Design a protein around this ligand. Structure first.
Ligand SMILES: Nc1ncccc1NCc1cc(-c2ccc3cc[nH]c3c2)ccc1OCc1ccccn1
Length: 377
């Protein structure tokens, strides 16, 4: 699996992309890796933000499905024309599959100005595919047409340029330390999991655990932040705020409405607490926990044109859509999307960013009762 190591690039807050080829002869595109959606969709027109786009006219293996897709979201949208064509991943398995492609022909606040990707690879399940679950997702097609085993894994490193590895069809042991711990995929739509307990600096929030998963908890490489349900967020921040009394900050900061700054090399990591999420284990009444550092949830914004020092953003935020374990979580861990066994494994990432004092951890087993009551129905 050494061919796939380091096959992911990106810029902070702009996601992780992999090189892909579409059509015959192959057209190289950089494609956002997204475990929180299930469409393979590529820019297919000269939007001014795009370095490159899919030119169906140049492809002998293109086939129109003569159906459109309209994909609205709160701040924007994309739409496109459905088709299929031959797809390959240069630094992935040595195969070529016929996949669905949404050729993107109009969009609003989708593509990022200054980014180096031109499409999105939705790695989640058909249930949430658009326009409906009849549109076979890429990975489903990959597995159905090849002998590539039904799993993939992600090491998102986050260092400006981030990097990482998407290991398709397996697991690379060099990408992590200690052991993998698995949590069940509750339902195959998003990569949905159940959080059974939350601690900040070891002290737990003492919240009905159903609040942690109202109405979903998901693993999502397409989101930057740790997103927590409102009631869990206010509780989490309240405790994070108290753990961090040594120094004071505006309320806007905790709402990601402002950023905070220190002098270069003078950021006080240790005034900020670790965050622990306990996940439902593979066995009745058994859990494990993952622990992240502030280096994960205070993410550096050097991007500031109106400043020149160590400024960071608070990378935890409220959500109406449930818990989202985004890059804030995923950058601590090697993450194994074990589709064959309906489970996600977490291990400590060989590449995560830590100090000499504290470290990202994956620990078990723990005893936690009533773990299925934590799930929202
Ligand atoms: N991963 C994820 N999580 C929550 C909601 C949506 C989602 N993925 C889809 C997505 C991604 C971006 C997005 C744009 C830019 C960047 C940069 C880093 N991450 C993103 C995500 C913008 C909109 C969006 O919704 C439209 C959609 C729906 C279904 C299938 C495909 N698309």
């Amino acid at each position: 699996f050494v061919e796939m190591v380091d096959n992911l690039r990106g810029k902070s807050g702009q996601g992780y992309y992999v090189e892909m080829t579409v059509g015959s002869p192959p057209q190289t595109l950089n494609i956002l890796v997204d475990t929180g959606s299930s469409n393979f969709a590529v820019g297919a027109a000269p939007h001014p933000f795009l370095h490159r786009y899919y030119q169906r006219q140049l492809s002998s293996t293109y086939r129109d499905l003569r159906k459109g897709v309209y994909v609205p979201y709160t701040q924007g949208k994309w739409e496109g024309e459905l088709g299929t064509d031959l797809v390959s991943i240069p630094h992935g398995p040595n195969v070529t599959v016929r996949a669905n492609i949404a050729a993107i022909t109009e969009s609003d606040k989708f593509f990022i100005n200054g980014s180096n990707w031109e499409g999105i690879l939705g790695l989640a399940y058909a249930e949430i595919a658009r326009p409906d679950d009849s549109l076979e997702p890429f990975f489903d097609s990959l597995v159905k047409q090849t002998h590539v085993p039904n799993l993939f894994s992600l090491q998102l490193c986050g260092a400006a340029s981030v990097g990482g590895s998407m290991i398709i069809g397996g697991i690379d042991h060099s990408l992590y330390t200690g052991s993998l711990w698995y949590t069940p995929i509750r339902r195959e739509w998003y990569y949905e999991v159940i959080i059974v307990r939350v601690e900040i600096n070891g002290q737990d929030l003492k919240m009905d655990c159903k609040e942690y998963n109202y109405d979903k908890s998901i693993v999502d490489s397409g989101t930057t932040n740790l997103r927590l349900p409102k009631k869990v967020f206010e509780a989490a921040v309240k405790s994070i705020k108290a753990a961090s009394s040594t120094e004071k900050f505006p309320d806007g900061f905790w709402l990601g409405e402002q950023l905070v700054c220190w002098q270069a090399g003078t950021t006080p990591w240790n005034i900020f607490p670790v965050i622990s999420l306990y996940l439902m284990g593979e066995v009745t009444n058994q859990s494990f926990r993952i622990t992240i550092l502030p280096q994960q949830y205070l993410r550096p914004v050097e991007d500031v044109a109106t400043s020149q020092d160590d400024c960071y953003k608070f990378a935890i935020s409220q959500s109406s859509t449930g818990t989202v374990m985004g890059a804030v979580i995923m950058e601590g861990f090697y993450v194994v999307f074990d589709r064959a066994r309906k489970r996600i494994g977490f291990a400590v990432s060989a590449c995560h960013v830590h100090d000499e004092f504290r470290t990202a951890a994956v620990e078990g087993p723990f005893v936690t009762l009533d773990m299925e009551d934590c799930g929202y129905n």
